[PDB]
Design a protein around this ligand. Structure first.
Ligand SMILES: O=P(O)(O)O[C@H]1[C@@H](OP(=O)(O)O)[C@@H](OP(=O)(O)O)[C@H](OP(=O)(O)OP(=O)(O)O)[C@@H](OP(=O)(O)O)[C@@H]1OP(=O)(O)O
Ligand SMILES: O=P(O)(O)O[C@H]1[C@H](OP(=O)(O)O)[C@@H](OP(=O)(O)O)[C@H](OP(=O)(O)O)[C@@H](OP(=O)(O)O)[C@H]1OP(=O)(O)O
Length: 154
C-alpha cells in the first residue's frame, strides 16, 4: 500500500476528478490518472514542487483564482466559475483534476454547476456538495447553484 490520493479526492465523471491541493505525497497517485489538465480555483501561485510535477507529466494548468470568503459576506464568483466550466466541458482537456485548497467550497460550486447542466434535481446536487463540505457546508454555495442560469451552456 503506497498511493495517497489528494485531500477529498473523488471521481466526478468520466475524465473528471475533484480534490483539495495536491502535495508531493500525492504525485505517484495522480500519475496513475494520466491527467491532461488541472483546473485550479485559488489565486495563490502554484508551488515549485507542483510546477515541476506538471512539467514532468505534460499537464496543462488552468488557474481561475477565486478569493476565499466566509459566510455571511461572500463573493459571487460567476465569471470565474463559468470560465472554469468552459474548460471542464471541453473533452480535449480530459482527464482533468479540479482542485482548490480543501476541495469543499470553490471546487464544490464548480461541480454543482456541472451537475445542473447534467439536469440533476437541486436536492441531488446539494446532497453531493454536502458529502464533501460536511460540517463546513455553506448555504451561500448552494444558493449560488440554485440561482445559476444554465442558458449560455445549453
Ligand atoms: O477560519 P479560517 O482561518 O479562515 O480558515 C479557513 C478554512 O476553515 P477552518 O480551517 O477554520 O475550518 C477553510 O477550510 P474549510 O472550511 O474548507 O474546512 C478554507 O477554505 P477552503 O480551504 O475550504 O476552500 P475550498 O478549497 O474548499 O474552496 C479557508 O481557505 P481560503 O481562505 O478560503 O482559501 C481558510 O483556510 P486558510 O486558513 O488556509 O486560509
Ligand atoms: O471586473 P468586473 O467587470 O467588475 O467584474 C467583477 C470581477 O469578475 P471577473 O474579474 O472574474 O470577471 C471580480 O473579480 P476580480 O476581477 O476582482 O478578480 C468578481 O469577484 P469574484 O471573482 O470574487 O466573484 C466580481 O464578482 P462579485 O462582485 O459578484 O463577487 C465581478 O463583478 P460583477 O459581479 O461582474 O460586477
Amino acid at each position: 500500500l503506497h498511493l495517497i490520493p489528494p485531500l477529498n479526492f473523488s471521481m466526478v465523471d468520466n475524465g473528471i476528478f475533484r480534490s483539495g491541493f495536491p502535495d508531493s505525497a500525492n504525485f505517484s497517485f495522480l500519475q496513475t490518472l494520466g491527467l491532461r489538465s488541472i483546473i485550479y480555483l485559488c489565486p495563490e501561485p502554484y508551488p515549485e514542487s507542483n510546477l515541476q510535477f506538471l512539467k514532468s507529466n505534460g499537464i496543462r494548468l488552468f488557474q481561475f483564482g477565486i478569493e476565499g470568503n466566509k459566510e455571511p459576506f461572500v463573493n459571487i464568483p460567476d465569471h470565474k466559475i463559468r470560465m472554469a466550466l468552459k474548460v471542464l466541458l471541453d473533452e480535449k482537456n480530459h482527464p482533468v483534476l479540479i482542485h482548490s485548497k480543501r476541495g469543499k467550497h470553490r471546487t464544490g460550486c464548480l461541480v454543482g454547476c456541472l451537475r445542473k447542466l447534467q439536469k440533476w434535481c437541486l436536492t441531488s446536487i446539494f446532497d453531493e456538495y454536502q458529502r464533501f463540505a460536511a460540517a463546513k457546508a455553506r448555504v451561500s454555495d448552494q444558493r449560488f447553484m440554485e440561482i445559476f442560469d444554465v442558458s449560455s451552456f445549453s
